[PDB]
Amino acid sequence: GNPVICMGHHAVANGTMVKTLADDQVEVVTAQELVESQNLPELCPSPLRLVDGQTCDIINGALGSPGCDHLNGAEWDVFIERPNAVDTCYPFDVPEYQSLRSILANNGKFEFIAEEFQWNTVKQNGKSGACKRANVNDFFNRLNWLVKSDGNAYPLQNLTKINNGDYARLYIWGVHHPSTDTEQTNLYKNNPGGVTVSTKTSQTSVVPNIGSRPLVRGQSGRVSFYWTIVEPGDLIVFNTIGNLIAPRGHYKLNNQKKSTILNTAIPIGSCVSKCHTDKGSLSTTKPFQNISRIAVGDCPRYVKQGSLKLATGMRNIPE
Amino acid sequence: GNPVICMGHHAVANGTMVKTLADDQVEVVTAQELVESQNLPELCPSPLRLVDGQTCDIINGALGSPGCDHLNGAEWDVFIERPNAVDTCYPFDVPEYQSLRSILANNGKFEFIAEEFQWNTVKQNGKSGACKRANVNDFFNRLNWLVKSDGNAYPLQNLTKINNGDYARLYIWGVHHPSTDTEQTNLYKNNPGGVTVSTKTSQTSVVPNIGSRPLVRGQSGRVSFYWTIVEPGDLIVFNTIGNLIAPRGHYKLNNQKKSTILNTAIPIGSCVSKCHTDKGSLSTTKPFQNISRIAVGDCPRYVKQGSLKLATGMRNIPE
Amino acid sequence: GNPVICMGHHAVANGTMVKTLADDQVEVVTAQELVESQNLPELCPSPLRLVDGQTCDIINGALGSPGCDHLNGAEWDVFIERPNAVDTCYPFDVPEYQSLRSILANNGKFEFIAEEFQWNTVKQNGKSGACKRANVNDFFNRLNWLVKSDGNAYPLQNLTKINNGDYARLYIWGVHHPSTDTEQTNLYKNNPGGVTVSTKTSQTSVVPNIGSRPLVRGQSGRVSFYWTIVEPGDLIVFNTIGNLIAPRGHYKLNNQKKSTILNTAIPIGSCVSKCHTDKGSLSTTKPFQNISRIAVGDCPRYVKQGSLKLATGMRNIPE
Amino acid sequence: GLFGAIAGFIENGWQGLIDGWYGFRHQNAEGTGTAADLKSTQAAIDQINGKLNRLIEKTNDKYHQIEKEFEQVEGRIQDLEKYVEDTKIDLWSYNAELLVALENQHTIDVTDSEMNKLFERVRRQLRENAEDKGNGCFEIFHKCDNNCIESIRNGTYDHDIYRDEAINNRFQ
Amino acid sequence: GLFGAIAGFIENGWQGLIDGWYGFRHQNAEGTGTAADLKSTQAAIDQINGKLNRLIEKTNDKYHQIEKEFEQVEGRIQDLEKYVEDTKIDLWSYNAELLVALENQHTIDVTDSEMNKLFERVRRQLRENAEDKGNGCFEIFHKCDNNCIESIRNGTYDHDIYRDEAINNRFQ
Amino acid sequence: GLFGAIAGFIENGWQGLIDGWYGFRHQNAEGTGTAADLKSTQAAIDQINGKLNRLIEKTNDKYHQIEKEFEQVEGRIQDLEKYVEDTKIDLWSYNAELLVALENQHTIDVTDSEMNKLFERVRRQLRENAEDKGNGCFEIFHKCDNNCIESIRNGTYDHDIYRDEAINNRFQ
Numbered sequence A, B, C: 001g002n003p004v005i006c007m008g009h010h011a012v013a014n015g016t017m018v019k020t021l022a023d024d025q026v027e028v029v030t031a032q033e034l035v036e037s038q039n040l041p042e043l044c045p046s047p048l049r050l051v052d053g054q055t056c057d058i059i060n061g062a063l064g065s066p067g068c069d070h071l072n073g074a075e076w077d078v079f080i081e082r083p084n085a086v087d088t089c090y091p092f093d094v095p096e097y098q099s100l101r102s103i104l105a106n107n108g109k110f111e112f113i114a115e116e117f118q119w120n121t122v123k124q125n126g127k128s129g130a131c132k133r134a135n136v137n138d139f140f141n142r143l144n145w146l147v148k149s150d151g152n153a154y155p156l157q158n159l160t161k162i163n164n165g166d167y168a169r170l171y172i173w174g175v176h177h178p179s180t181d182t183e184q185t186n187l188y189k190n191n192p193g194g195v196t197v198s199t200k201t202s203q204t205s206v207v208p209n210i211g212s213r214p215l216v217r218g219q220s221g222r223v224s225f226y227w228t229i230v231e232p233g234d235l236i237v238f239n240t241i242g243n244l245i246a247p248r249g250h251y252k253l254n255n256q257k258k259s260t261i262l263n264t265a266i267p268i269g270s271c272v273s274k275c276h277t278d279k280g281s282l283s284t285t286k287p288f289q290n291i292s293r294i295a296v297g298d299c300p301r302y303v304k305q306g307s308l309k310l311a312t313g314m315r316n317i318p319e
Numbered sequence D, E, F: 001g002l003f004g005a006i007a008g009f010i011e012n013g014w015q016g017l018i019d020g021w022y023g024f025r026h027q028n029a030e031g032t033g034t035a036a037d038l039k040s041t042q043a044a045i046d047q048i049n050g051k052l053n054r055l056i057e058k059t060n061d062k063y064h065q066i067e068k069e070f071e072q073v074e075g076r077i078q079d080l081e082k083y084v085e086d087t088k089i090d091l092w093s094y095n096a097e098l099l100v101a102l103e104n105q106h107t108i109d110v111t112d113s114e115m116n117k118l119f120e121r122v123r124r125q126l127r128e129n130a131e132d133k134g135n136g137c138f139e140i141f142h143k144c145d146n147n148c149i150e151s152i153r154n155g156t157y158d159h160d161i162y163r164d165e166a167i168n169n170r171f172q
């Protein structure tokens, strides 16, 4: 009665600590990290379709400000908006800015359908020094600045665009706020002005607000931009006695809107990834990440923990 | 030393696959489905109280449009709003539409309390061809269209309603937007009009907006509706120099608001269920469902999975 | 072959019932309650910094209404706002009330920086019987009521404040709504009035609304308050032809905003706690609480359950 | 399973066991038989029902909520409403996925455990009168008629009655 | 429990065992006694306190949030605020309900396991010198005085010392 | 572990076992040796892989969401957006924290279980020919050359062959 057989298990010199229900630090033979804490220093242009706005944010892109011509016809899964983007035109605001930005970004393309508006008597294509294009006074190339005729006339405008296409139309238009009563009359004769844009079931009415604003690119006036969506089987009516910044057409809206926008200064590179944060793309399989709450695409879920180790082996008890 | 006794367990010919932590497909003897993927093709009128709006949505129901008389006095747990509901009156909009719809739906009843408004000099009960009732020009029967007297007078209106009841009051009122300066003067003499409705601590002021809107039922004008809630111990003051669409009273608000609205084309049947989706009622005990995120009542929780099988037996190893 | 040794475990006369996956009531030797269902009848002033608004809510505190002088210079982690707070000044409203209240509360201090505004011709320091201070007609001590000169003049106001400090500035200002045309002219000569306040990139324009409101402290008029934030490197421009309730300076905004507000009638005591509810502070280590969804500080997570017992011992099988 | 009984040293289940989850299968001089064990079967069943009752339990009784379907995009507020609902759904879908997984893993370990408990019960009944064959079967080292077998199944088996016979057979 | 010791082959607990969670109860020629086992008791306690520390752990430190009480209905935005909070509370309440259930099920399985470990430890100490009676008790087939018993409890028991005596008693 | 094998009656692991997770270590007249067990190792590995597959599984494929960073405070709506995202993050962080803890606790119990299963397998192969020494080692009471040892490891060991020799050595 002398031979002996022993049953046992493997071990390593130095294992990895993991958490359980009952212990914050248990040494196991092998483990796998579930939190991704590294990012790429660049944005991957594949397999998602990225469009770099460069010096234009998505709002000035849509208005057609100087320097945004490269965005014409662009299509994107993710619009890349740059923090150092700058205004290069007449000073403006958008009462529901984030909402318009959301719509443009979500839609995912800049497909503009030009249209002829038969405006009456009034002069078209007004320009400004605040919006210069190659040293020449210009304006938003998607917008049409209406002013009084040489005969000092600004008659009531009353125009209709009917939509019997198979897509919803996005009309972007604006109302100009002069600095003084003089500027008001000098531009639009009538005082006060007024704009009313309406569909069958919705409407927007704006009365201009005359007053001095801070000087921006040599202007105390402001343009406030609005938008109107026109569904198939609907129609839009523009009504003005002054101060209208008219559209030159409409943007096409996709029926299905699948896109978005990402604001970051990180440059676009040559890598391949379907997950993008504002800190750069991720190339990982881990189920979680702690890099940024701002993440677009096929991404790990954002968590606060810097590390969460999944045990992939038994307890390590060496010797 | 020859007899033998064996310990064992049962098995079936063909078992059911379930998921665990370690295996996506394990065969067990029996299992139970936790996701409900079947619905009834109808809405159950018991034990919840449903009110079918039919051709009237809840907003026109509150306004008292033609065809909505059947909703008078209605009380509901769930207002059933129909996709094919149509406008049958003067073209209108509601600046905070979804908010008004929410309040009316949540309140859960149409209890209208008529009141006498001693309007001065002005004509009452204005009607329109856009809102015909049995071939006769009419209007919202909860609203009162004030216009100038035959003596071409529209004096400043200045009326007060005090609330010393034991319930909060909902006043629904509107402001009319004429198509032209002519229509403005022809209706209200003064130009411009103006409305101010206020309580002790809140107020709403509206200036009419004259302009051409699209033709709807033969009208280029629009009515914009607003509302004012008057708590017990408070009072409401109506102030007008034109264009007011006056209330004929107020709706009673329940102190506790427990109701809601469900928009669907699904017909009401004869079944019994306390869970309603926009696809029809559910008759199930399962803890989850994948039919619709839109669910009202005592319902299973909505999940994405089409199926989730709970093991109710041991592993099946047949032969 | 006679001795016997037995292996066993302890038990008590009466144990505690707990829940598991398979049983709603299991008796274990010991258990620990994880839901905190008791609160203190007072608010702990340590170690968090509490500021009692007393008879002043945070809005009148900011405006500097009579009775709010005690809030001058105050700094808080949690502003304690009282349900029985009352208005002691000219009747007012705030178009985005909850938004302004949030900003003030979140900012966490009342550091007012007085500035000299070189208003032209107009009289300053207008007062009112609705806002008495020691039997003398007064006003919000942070606001400056501009009215017409003795020479019956109210010239266009056109003033600029530039921000080259290292902090963002909060300007609070208002627009007065007269009860009648007479009151309008008697106060501001011009009719109508008008206000335009703007920065480089933002603006707010308000036209007064003349009409009768309910009598509050002997007044039918109302003041609507607005605000403008001016970042470093930006500037603000005030533009008025009447009805402006001008600021006397600006509040300092912290870069990092970490504070909040708690509305409750619970008195402040002498206890120490970092968790505050609207029902009183909590002093507990439990991970959960069922006292109130409204909780500020280092608090247990709010749950619906009144009790959840964690087993801290084996199953109790006595005798 | 954690105990390695079901799909372990028990090679397979018994399709002929139709009146129980666990049971006895024997062979003696008189013949063969299969009989279900009541206590083991009930223990497994009760614990599985406990899961069922706790699971199919609580209401989720909701009425006025938020809009969840939208004709056209509006922007900021609609984005938040859509984001709130999608967030809710993912979390709950996760909960469901995990819950079922947890229950099933536990259900299998419980049933595997109950099998093992039955084998161990009988092992302790037999004492030195039998030997583990390794396949969940005990070789009984004494004559054991149908009455003897039943006494094992119903727990009245007295090992001292057969011990002398059994020890003699085992070790000579 | 998964191992079937507590509320299993151990018929009940000991109310007289007030200094430990597990222990020994013996009877020999000199009398009877009950003594706690420190190692088994401590193992159970450490794992249970471990749960407690991980549970009663992390802050949830929140200040500026959203309004959660409302005087009167406002509509869309208030509906969303109300819906967001109600959604949050249900999710956390679920988490709490499940957490306690998971911990408790595990706590019972651990304690049942630790009982079983102690019995198995002693079983291995005794070798061929004792027999399992079926109730968590071992019949010892040799004279075992108080010093002998203590050697078992403190793990110094040497089976070879009594082996001849024990085997002779067992099989003759 | 629940079974008390790993970090239990097995005092420690084997750093020399580099081609398996579990195995055999023997000493006979011919010498000593260590050899991995394929079935036990594979069983542990497969179940851990199942966890990995189910864990590193599903997409979370999101595009248009909400703003999550803000230059300056705006009030009510921004408060709600911030509150929504913060609520979301805490819940998922909770989910992750609990998930890993649950998996790891289960992983340790599985591996400890697979260790115990192997020991029990060999125990049943050896029958009355060996005795448990208490440290995961069996004292074999008959001559066992390398072929004999291998027959144990590969499961072809026939206890009846050595039974007479073994019984005689054990009890005389």
Ligand SMILES: *[C@@H]1O[C@H](CO)[C@@H](O)[C@H](O)[C@H]1NC(C)=O
Residues within 6 Å of the ligand: A158, A159, A160, A237, B179, B180, B212, B220
């Ligand atoms: C112009 O306005 C009149 C009424 O003022 C309206 O009947 C007509 O349809 C309008 N024309 C267009 C082209 O909108």
Ligand SMILES: *[C@@H]1O[C@H](CO)[C@@H](O)[C@H](O)[C@H]1NC(C)=O
Residues within 6 Å of the ligand: A037, A290, A291, A305, A306, A307
């Ligand atoms: C993410 O975790 C890593 C460590 O895993 C840590 O160094 C880093 O700071 C974390 N990122 C954060 C907290 O944003």
Ligand SMILES: *[C@@H]1O[C@H](CO)[C@@H](O)[C@H](O)[C@H]1NC(C)=O
Residues within 6 Å of the ligand: B158, B159, B160, B237, C179, C180, C212, C220
């Ligand atoms: C009418 O207005 C005057 C002031 O213009 C006010 O004194 C009076 O109370 C008002 N009457 C009603 C009934 O509102």
Ligand SMILES: *[C@@H]1O[C@H](CO)[C@@H](O)[C@H](O)[C@H]1NC(C)=O
Residues within 6 Å of the ligand: B037, B290, B291, B305, B306, B307
């Ligand atoms: C729900 O699940 C069933 C299968 O269980 C599937 O056929 C159905 O399409 C699902 N419903 C959805 C995805 O809306």
Ligand SMILES: *[C@@H]1O[C@H](CO)[C@@H](O)[C@H](O)[C@H]1NC(C)=O
Residues within 6 Å of the ligand: A179, A180, A212, C158, C159, C160, C237
């Ligand atoms: C006053 O207004 C004029 C134009 O109307 C402007 O040039 C000037 O800067 C303004 N002054 C101040 C102090 O804002």
Ligand SMILES: *[C@@H]1O[C@H](CO)[C@@H](O)[C@H](O)[C@H]1NC(C)=O
Residues within 6 Å of the ligand: C037, C290, C291, C305, C306, C307
């Ligand atoms: C909290 O739970 C206690 C019991 O633990 C109960 O008495 C109390 O009413 C609960 N508080 C609620 C439901 O607000």
